[PDB]
Amino acid sequence: SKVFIRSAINRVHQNSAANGGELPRIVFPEGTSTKVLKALATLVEEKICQPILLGYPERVKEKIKALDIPLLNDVSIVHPSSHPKYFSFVEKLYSLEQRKGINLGEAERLMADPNYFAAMMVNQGEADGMVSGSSINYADAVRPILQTIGVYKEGIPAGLNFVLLEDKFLVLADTTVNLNPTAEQCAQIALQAAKIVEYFGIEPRVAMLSYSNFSGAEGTPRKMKKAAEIARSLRPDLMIEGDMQADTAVNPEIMERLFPFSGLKGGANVLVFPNLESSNIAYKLIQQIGKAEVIGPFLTGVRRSANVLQRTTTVDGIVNSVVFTALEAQYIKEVLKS
Amino acid sequence: SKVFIRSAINRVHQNSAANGGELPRIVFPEGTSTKVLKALATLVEEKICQPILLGYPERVKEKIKALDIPLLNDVSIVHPSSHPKYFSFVEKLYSLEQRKGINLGEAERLMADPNYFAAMMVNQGEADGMVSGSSINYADAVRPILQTIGVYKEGIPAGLNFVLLEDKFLVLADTTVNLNPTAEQCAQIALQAAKIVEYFGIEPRVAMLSYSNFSGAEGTPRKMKKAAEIARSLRPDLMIEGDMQADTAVNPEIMERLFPFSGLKGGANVLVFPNLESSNIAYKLIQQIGKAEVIGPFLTGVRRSANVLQRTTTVDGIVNSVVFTALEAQYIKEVLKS
Amino acid sequence: SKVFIRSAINRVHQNSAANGGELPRIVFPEGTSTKVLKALATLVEEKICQPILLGYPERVKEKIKALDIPLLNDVSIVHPSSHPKYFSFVEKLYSLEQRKGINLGEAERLMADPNYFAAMMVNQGEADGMVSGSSINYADAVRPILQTIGVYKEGIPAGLNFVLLEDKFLVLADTTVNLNPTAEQCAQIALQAAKIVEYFGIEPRVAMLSYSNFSGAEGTPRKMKKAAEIARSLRPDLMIEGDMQADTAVNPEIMERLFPFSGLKGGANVLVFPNLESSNIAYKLIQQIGKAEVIGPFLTGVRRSANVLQRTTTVDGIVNSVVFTALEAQYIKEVLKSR
Amino acid sequence: SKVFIRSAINRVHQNSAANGGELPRIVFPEGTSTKVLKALATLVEEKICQPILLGYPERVKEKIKALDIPLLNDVSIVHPSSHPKYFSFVEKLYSLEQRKGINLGEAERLMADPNYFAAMMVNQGEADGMVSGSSINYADAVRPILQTIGVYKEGIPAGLNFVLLEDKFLVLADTTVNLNPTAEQCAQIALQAAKIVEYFGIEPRVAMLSYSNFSGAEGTPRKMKKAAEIARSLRPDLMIEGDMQADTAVNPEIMERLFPFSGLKGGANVLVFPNLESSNIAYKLIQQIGKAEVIGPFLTGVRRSANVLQRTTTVDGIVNSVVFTALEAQYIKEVLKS
Amino acid sequence: SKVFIRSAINRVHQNSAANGGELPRIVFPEGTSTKVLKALATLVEEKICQPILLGYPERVKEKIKALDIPLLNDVSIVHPSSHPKYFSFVEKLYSLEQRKGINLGEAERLMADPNYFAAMMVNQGEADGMVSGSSINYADAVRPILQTIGVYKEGIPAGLNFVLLEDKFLVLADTTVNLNPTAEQCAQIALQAAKIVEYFGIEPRVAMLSYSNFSGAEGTPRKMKKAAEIARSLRPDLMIEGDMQADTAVNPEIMERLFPFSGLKGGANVLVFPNLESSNIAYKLIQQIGKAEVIGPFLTGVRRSANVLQRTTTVDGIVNSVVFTALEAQYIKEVLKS
Amino acid sequence: SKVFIRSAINRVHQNSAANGGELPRIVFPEGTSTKVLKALATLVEEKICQPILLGYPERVKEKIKALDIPLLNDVSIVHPSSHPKYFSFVEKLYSLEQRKGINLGEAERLMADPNYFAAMMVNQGEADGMVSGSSINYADAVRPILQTIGVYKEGIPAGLNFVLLEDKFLVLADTTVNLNPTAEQCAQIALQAAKIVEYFGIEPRVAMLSYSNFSGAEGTPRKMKKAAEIARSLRPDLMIEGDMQADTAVNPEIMERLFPFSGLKGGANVLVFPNLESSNIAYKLIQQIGKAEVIGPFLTGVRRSANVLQRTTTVDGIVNSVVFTALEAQYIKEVLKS
């Protein structure tokens, strides 16, 4: 329920009150987006972020009034190629990609794209985070983030979703990025997801999912089994298990009845998938047919706070997303300070 | 929820009358299975089938007595190797597999196993159907069925599940058999699933699922796109579409909003998966954390009625499986009669 | 030298002539390109085409006056998203690409880009041809063209260059598109190049090039041998031979001394390459250290007239390319009329 | 051009003057080859080497007699199987190849062949160098050399050509040996070609060629980029760059205008190719339709002086090859000193 | 011929005496096998082991009486699931394979099979050795052994045969297990077979067989050449050579005449094969038409004494196999004592 | 078994007597080979062929005198490059191979080689057959034969051997040419061996060999099973069976006892192998350790009579080879006749 979301919002507020009442600056490349503007309407009342819109200030304000949203009257609106830092931004993209097939004119056009300008703003500290992708497909939204902000060391870019049940939440990954991760990659995805779960003061219990129950046969079963093993080696305090079926994974009673030798007791709260088909289809089906709220996807593995909305998002979806992006922004900022 | 199930039960009873009051003979290989016996208690109350249990008669009746299930007192009990037709069953399997690495002694040992004896019984018309796999893994349960009964022509063996929502039901396949079906195979899975949906007087609307929305890129998007094309060609009367995401697939509003050129209007009620990981994980997660009853899996494509319980089944699940196994047994009976 | 080009220019003029005097309309996506503007300066004096510039009309006219090029003051300038057919163009692109991962907003942004807009103009007959790619790399320039105009049936997109020697010309293909064409693809490239050579009233004589002389060993020698064979089957009237080395191919005397069984007599004037590396590197090296004129690349296999300049082009290069583009446009116009 | 050859000949004359007046012994397997005979007339009218002819003395001397070239005189003529060291040569070949499917009779028949005899002569110091391949195809011509003389450590056999422009010369490699070299191999070829350029007191400027300008995309662009990086690591003092197009490589002005971040200034004089097709077709087309004198190929990577004439060679071509073979024999001699 | 076999027999008598009066316990899963029983008749006459038969004791007794075999009236007969150690056996198998897809019921059902019970008996020391596989194919017989007894450190499971010539004996491997062993694997098989030949106080001279004589060509020639080199490195005192042909390998005169450089003199007595076709077909053809006695196969690489009979065996074959099973059991027993 | 060989010799005498007394002309490229000459001593006494020796006449006759072989100094001796037909032979090889990387000079050098010249003589009818390879390896001897004479339509070049037992002879193929023949190829080898066996008035009974008995598993079992199937379709009058083990194949009792459904009764006399390792090693092992005489290999599938001695041949071996070569030459000549 929205118990989880309100707890998150309050955690934002304790962080903000803990830092002089400052709010995180969040860039929205899609400054003219109906759904983004409506979500922001809700979001600026509850003091969750300082929003920054990208686009022509004129038609952004004209669509704000068209949409009848008066508390957006004053929000910062930035036109990328008109910004003072534009050309240095361009020189920085060009410098990082001139041996990946990009000439200076192309760097110019790319930096004029709000997605790239946003990613660069976050990289350059002109913002604390960004939220994009309501109007474009995921790959196109995420490419500038990966090229400009990039991943931290031994991290891997991986999408993550929360499934909110009455008792607890489950975490699902990688729901958006990697088609068919290796065992090593699957373990790294488990580690990132585990750390996220720990941030909420929850004990991570991790299952490596398969169509198989503890078979270890060639292909995905041995893949998920060996993923469990690698992960366990990297973090021996954790309950991490696989290969197993999904129902075996979440249902403690089934696990105990059928596989009492298993190291995973009490049901898994972290679900790592073997390929993008299973993760993507699963989160989306649970979101539409199940009676549980699903929030995300959230992009893990990267050096700064940047999340891509799924194109099928709702206005509430965007709201939840901006909330957790704000939390993330605050968290990364503290680490930078230290 | 149970409305659909009660509808099925009444169609079982309505078919049995107008067919001489006959109940389908359903053989259960696991004659001593607790979950099977308890489910059968419910099931013989409801006049759904004549159950035939396989095992050593004294051990069967003494566990019936242990569980104190007084109405499984007169059910038929068969011991495979003591049965009159045992020796001929052995010779028929031996003639079928003597060049697939199986000698006469091995055929004897195999036919003495209840799964194989059950499969043979059904193949030979000594039973109308079978239900197995409550105690063993799916692969092991399904093997004798496939070797002995086999598929009808241009069929493909594929598991299918029902998701029961308040207004409608969804169908998911292939949830159990094929690791990584080709486009041709996926199209066939869609056709089989389609006719199952038609049996209940529902119009089949088919989505070929992917992590992509109409991208047609190399790999899974291209596979499912071309699957949609083959399926459409074989049945130009059906709404069949892909490649698409799951939420796009089921939600008519999202579809209309984002992809109005689509041939699928009003949401899909048939969901065909690109690989076993995605189908298997999806049905089990929807079943465990959503709030829909999920029934199956049911083995489609095969010449006689034979379905394998998932190892994680409950007693109630076994009851549902037997209901639809009964319906299927009846249907296949009239076809044979023709 | 200057002979081949002046003959081409004169052929453009004889074509505009028994046609009402109409000049092909050629669209240029890069309305502000210095090199494009200088080339057009030279070319409009030569009466070969009606140029159309794409871009914001004020930045175009400001670049024209800055370069002090008075003969362009008159020329048509179009801004894609302001143009009347913009939205129907958007709808036609979307309809072409909505199952290739492109949504309507994406079709709009694409059509607002001059490369796509020019491609659609040419496709829709609002222009007779296009010349692009002075400022972007070849893959990016050529993509909108293939997606929009596309190939005619069993055609294959292939870059072609003229090597202009004192007596004769050589044609080189495929110099820009296919990384590693199959034997069937090499054959189709050869036929395309052949018909181009015939257009100038020359008999096409075709060599499938390799690092080997008539070995047929596995890999490329075998590929070019079977290419030579497929080509011959599809056109038994042409001298087509391979696998052979390049000097063997161009030099008639080497051929007759060393491989008299060869079906190619008198030196090849058509050179089909085994992979993109060899064709691309070869034409560029000949152009840089050779003392012969090299023209192109020209995009063959596509249903309408559309050519992509090499990014390393000079002003004269663009002049030549536009000339032969005007020619291609006239020809394709007549074919379109006929069908 | 003419100056280049004249200077090469003069550097031979200085090497000879620096050593008592000794000229390198060069073996010609093709003792009856017309082209070889005329070219030799020229070659020690100009004091370049002591030629050794291989063949049946009577017919080599009768074709010397036919063509009326008579300070080819008492020029040394050796018949392989008649030579005193013939059986010791036979055993040395046998020891080298008895585990490569070569028996004693086979070593005998092979050693009686002038190509093998020549190679062994050079290995054993009965000669200083060899020039062959006027009458047979390159692979066969080069095989005895690679088996008998071999490569120096971490050297790689690679054909090299000079394009003589009369401002400067270019080197092209590998034009004859390797079909599809790895990035590592491309790097080693670059090093070999660089040292040859240094021999003439010129700064080697090295381009790793492609159809791409600094893209690094999968396939050859990534290959040539990673070759340039490897070579730079092995030789931090050299301008080495890639991936790039050919005209980009040779033209300094194009490079500076379009790719100013490049580490290669003033145009490349060393061109390393991604595969044999491109190199072979390039050198040959330049030689036949440009107006630039091209000399070679010359075989680099081998432990002693040995070159293979392209069968399409001219008589002057042979003269040039012998000039540089003599140069190389001298260079190797002083390096052997210390 | 049989000189070798009774020498084998009385040396068995020599250990049984050298440790009191102990006879090895040898378990026979195939208690109702006619050929096994007839063989046991001969074998219990000559005091080589204490035989244990597996099966229902009375149908074993009925088959013993029918065949009129008076010396088996006394032999121990055990029914697996009636045995005291049965469930503990089940549980230790369950623990060994629970992550390789075997649940507790499956482990129960498997342990009820004589092959598995026999393997477990030998592993747990309720027997010293086992002989199986007369009635079932080799793969099925050898599986319980590999799962239960398994391989010793870096050993590899491999079948070995003796060809008994009048002057000498040859050993052939791997005749049963590996389809296409690598060069390393071939080397390990060679080392193992070598220690077997040494046990009989014979000097092992090892040939890595091929269709080639010292060619080292790609495929099998290279593989066997490198196998010889690895083997030689692992064991520098042994004559180990290849790649070579079979006649070259066994015939010393051919070896010296045609390949005198070879490091293997006097003919090979250890023959390692490149793939299973060649070894299997070779041993069988020699046994049938070669007019020589062939004994085995014997399973090498395994931690306890366990051998699988070929299905095509005779009674005499079974007799020989049991003899050497006893020998293997005793050697292993004493080194287990250590 | 000299009965079989003397039957062969006498059947030659009847063929030559039945066509005027003409003996087949057999070319021996190795005119100076000791073993070939000693063999010819035996062979010309018994009127088996008119031998033709290749080489320089003087050193041929001088080794004939050295070896003290008086019955040979009238035998015809041909020096290839001195022969009247040399140039026409050259142009014919050249026309055959000018597009396989062979130039006219290369055609000259090849034709001057005795192996090529012998092959061309036989091809062109200047001889009836050839025998070679006593002194070189099999691939090199067989190459000119395959290039010059070639295969008849849908034939495949395959080495065949006879194993001569008391009662029976066996045929083994392909023992020398194909590394890993497809099912189609194994079938074709079976047909070729079959017609050879029919020639001696024996009924061919064909087994497709494997390490498996009727398993049909992936790899070799499936291959040999489908080979058996194809062969049966191409020759419906023959008993042809597989996959089976070698002892299964040869032993009729093992066959009926264990696989009575098998189509092969009375033991196979034609053994087709799955790969070159197995055939080659089997053939050589039977020849060295089993004492049955082994004759061959003989090259089947080719348009004219040409056989290659194994390099390990004895003199007696060569005599046998020439005998059956003569027979083959006579049969082929009658085929040519009509």
Residue numbers in the entry:
A (entry chain B), B (entry chain A), D (entry chain D), E (entry chain F), F (entry chain E): 439 to 776
C (entry chain C): 439 to 777
Verbatim from the authors:
Bacterial hybrid malic enzymes (MaeB grouping, multidomain) catalyse the transformation of malate to pyruvate, and are a major contributor to cellular reducing power and carbon flux.
An extension from d1 (residues 524–550, forming a loop with two helices that we term the 3′ loop) sits over the 3′-phosphate group, interacting via residues R535 and K538. Using HPLC as a readout, we were able to prevent acetyl-CoA binding by mutating R535 that makes a direct contact to the 3′ phosphate group. Variants R535E and R535A abolished acetyl-CoA binding, and generated an enzyme insensitive to allosteric inhibition by both CoA and acetyl-CoA, although these mutants retained ~70% activity to wild-type (wt) MaeB. We were also able to generate structures for R535E, R535A and N718D PTA domain variants, which demonstrate the same features as the wt PTAapo structure.
